[PDB]
Structure 1
Amino acid sequence: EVNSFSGYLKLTDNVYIKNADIVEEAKKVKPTVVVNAANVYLKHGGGVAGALNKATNNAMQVESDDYIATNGPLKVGGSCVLSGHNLAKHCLHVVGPNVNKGEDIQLLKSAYENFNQHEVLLAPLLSAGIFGADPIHSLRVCVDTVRTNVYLAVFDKNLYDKLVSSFLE
């Protein structure tokens, strides 16, 4: 079966959310697109990006280095489409701003706008965790910006509960 997402909670007509590890979701669903929470040189050194790359046994990193060699780095707020390897048909590498490193939070809207080029996506909550954005704010930007069908996997039950309670106020 195609894009067989299970156990999500529908927030809006096109945004769904689950307490889950995006890696485990990608292995089980094999979505058309999985979003990586990338940086501009596509160096998948830790967190979500490191986990997705490890699940490909480093194939994603080798492919990413080849892309950067030919094309140069991405911009903050930008994206590129590469192979999804064993995780998906395609991986959409999206660079959200890292506000812990001084990048402008306004670029989070630009980052989510990249999702609109794909009908269905499995994605993490952009710029959350160690990128330093307020995760409640990131969910609001996602809801207001994404118009295609997005399935958010958030790997922390405490944060999941806080996000759902915020959405339902």
Structure 2
Amino acid sequence: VNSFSGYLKLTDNVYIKNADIVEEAKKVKPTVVVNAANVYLKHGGGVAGALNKATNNAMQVESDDYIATNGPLKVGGSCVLSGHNLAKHCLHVVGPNVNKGEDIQLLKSAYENFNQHEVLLAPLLSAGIFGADPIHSLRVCVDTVRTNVYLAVFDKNLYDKLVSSFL
């Protein structure tokens, strides 16, 4: 039993809710919140900008030190950093950004990072300002992630479409 509340069950291991991931993280304080990161960990907008703002920019400060030491992530890759006031840990995962021309096949590699964590609160990778089809992102998630994932979808219209079209 865990503390996630109000989710619709899509599969054995995938759950979904119309929610603001920032507000959901503040309430649940999950072990892991996933950030929709880019390779530079520049958290300017979308989910990343929202999560960083909620940490009062501490996420960005920590991220800048990470990049200065380690260099950029790979598209499809991830790193574990602090969750600050939102979670124990933040798993920064880089989905392909269609608006940069990145290969959508890398979306599966991105979701594979979730399998290193037993339970996660997450957004749909590559959705929103990353330009992929969220219906496709949900399908890849369900077909790739085997650990327990609680998906927060900010847009109610999109949430209803994701549920109604789910096979």
Tell me the TM-score normalized by structure 2. 0.98
Return the offset for 1:3. Answer: 4.7
User: Does the CA-based 8 Å contact 1:124-1:152 persist in structure 2?
Assistant: yes
CA RMSD after TM alignment:
0.9
User: Does the CA-based 8 Å contact 1:3-1:32 persist in structure 2?
Assistant: no
Secondary structure of the 1:114 match is helix
Corresponding residue number in structure 2 for 1:152? 151
User: Does the CA-based 8 Å contact 1:109-1:141 persist in structure 2?
Assistant: yes
Return the offset for 1:130. Answer: 1.4
1:48-99 alpha-carbon deviations (Å, 9 max, x no partner): 1011001110100000000000000000000000000010000000000001
Corresponding residue number in structure 1 for 2:55? 56
1:123-169 alpha-carbon deviations (Å, 9 max, x no partner): 0011011111111000000000000000000001100010001114x
Corresponding residue number in structure 2 for 1:4? 3
Corresponding residue number in structure 2 for 1:30? 29
Secondary structure of the 2:165 match is helix
Corresponding residue number in structure 1 for 2:109? 110
Return the offset for 1:100. Answer: 1.3
Unaligned stretches of 5+ in structure 2? none
Secondary structure of the 1:17 match is strand
Return the offset for 1:122. Answer: 0.2
Taking structure 1 as reference, are residues 3 and 69 closer, same or farther at Cα in structure 2, changes over 3 Å only? farther
Corresponding residue number in structure 2 for 1:122? 121
User: Does the CA-based 8 Å contact 1:37-1:127 persist in structure 2?
Assistant: yes
Task: State how far apart, in whole Å, the 1-side matches of 2:58 and 2:97 are.
Answer: 25
Task: State how far apart, in whole Å, the 1-side matches of 2:24 and 2:166 are.
Answer: 22
Task: State how far apart, in whole Å, the 2-side matches of 1:131 and 1:82 are.
Answer: 22
Aligned length: 167
| Identity across matched positions, percent | 100
Task: State how far apart, in whole Å, the 2-side matches of 1:32 and 1:42 are.
Answer: 20
Secondary structure of the 1:60 match is helix
Unaligned stretches of 5+ in structure 1? none
